[PDB]
Design a protein around this ligand. Structure first.
Ligand SMILES: Nc1ncnc2c1ncn2[C@@H]1O[C@H](COP(=O)(O)OP(=O)(O)O)[C@@H](O)[C@H]1O
Ligand SMILES: [Cl-]
Ligand SMILES: [Mg+2]
Ligand SMILES: [Mg+2]
Lengths: 267, 33
């Protein structure tokens, strides 16, 4: 009655992770195509992030949204932990960005709309993703954006958080400055992401992380000349140093620049 | 206990096949205060 490793044929690696690989998978009976996320228990327990894996599995499995990747189930075998994820045929936005160097305003606004919708749903359930980045954004069979990797996420209806969570180039100032943080970290990373979609590079990118920490804390960056006034306005609002001064996701979805370039409506 | 999560772990028949399951979050907030 329970999941077993024998239930799946393992295909090519879909991507490498911090504690194991994600493989293309086939349920032997129904021939249903899936993604199998494999995590070694030794690496998880050594780094002491088992509690975070609990959060990833429990939170993602109970979420239901067209723009959020589905986690159908999980199982383990005293050596590895296996996550059964929804298959995203067109790969990452990261690979797409690398392929295209940069997105135009139509594509960028479309991705932001889909992402803001999914995040708005997350925050309504008091969930914070805390790891928004192109590598963690997948594309469906019709090119729809879907959030993935809830490996840094947390259910916080009560507490404000203290965990240094996320990825270097996308880390909010409050985390860097050793402050507490809330759901407003997703809107900072949304601003960092919108910049990278248009420019092709993170706004605080540097050779060292110490310099990156400095630039993030100062919110020290510039736009290339071709970035439109509407795009500059949206990004600047999302990249406020003061977390409470950052807009709401409802305000992002109703942003003039967003509604004039997006190919998809709001929730 | 370790690796015993509040999540689906049973075999699913993908040949066969709501929005409420979201209520798990509200439930958890109340339970844990
Ligand atoms: N459902 C999926 N469909 C297609 N590719 C995926 C899927 N899930 C993950 N991948 C690929 O494998 C990689 C796995 O990364 P991720 O799951 O975020 O690992 P970690 O949680 O350890 O960071 C992703 O960057 C992506 O490129
Ligand atoms: Cl610093
Ligand atoms: Mg990842
Ligand atoms: Mg992770």
């Amino acid at each position: 009655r329970q999941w077993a490793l024998e239930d799946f044929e393992i295909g090519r690696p879909l991507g490498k992770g911090k504690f194991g690989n994600v493989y293309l998978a086939r349920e032997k009976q129904s021939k249903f195509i899936l993604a199998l996320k494999v995590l070694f228990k030794a690496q998880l327990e050594k780094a002491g992030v088992e509690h975070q894996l609990r959060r990833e599995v429990e939170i993602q499995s109970h979420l239901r949204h067209p723009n959020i990747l589905r986690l159908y189930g999980y199982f383990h075998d005293a050596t590895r932990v296996y996550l059964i994820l929804e298959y995203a045929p067109l790969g990452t936005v990261y690979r797409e960005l690398q392929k295209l160097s940069k997105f135009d305003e139509q594509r960028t606004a479309t991705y932001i709309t889909e992402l803001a919708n999914a995040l708005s749903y997350c925050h309504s359930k008091r969930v914070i993703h805390r790891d928004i980045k192109p590598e963690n954004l997948l594309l469906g069979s019709a090119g729809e954006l879907k959030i993935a990797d809830f490996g840094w996420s947390v259910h916080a209806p009560s507490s404000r958080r203290t965990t240094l969570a996320g990825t270097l180039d996308y880390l909010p100032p409050e985390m860097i400055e050793g402050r507490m943080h809330d759901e407003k970290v997703d809107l900072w990373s949304l601003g960092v992401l919108c910049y990278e979609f248009l420019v092709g590079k993170p706004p605080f990118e540097a050779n060292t992380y110490q310099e990156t920490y400095k630039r993030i804390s100062r919110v020290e960056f510039t736009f290339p000349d071709f970035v439109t006034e509407g795009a500059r306005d949206l990004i600047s609002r999302l990249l406020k140093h003061n977390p409470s001064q950052r807009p709401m996701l409802r305000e992002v979805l109703e942003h003039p620049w967003i509604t004039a370039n997006s190919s998809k409506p709001s929730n | 206990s370790s690796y015993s999560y509040d999540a689906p772990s049973d075999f699913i028949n993908f040949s066969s096949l709501t929005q409420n399951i979201d209520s798990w979050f509200e439930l958890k907030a109340n339970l844990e205060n």
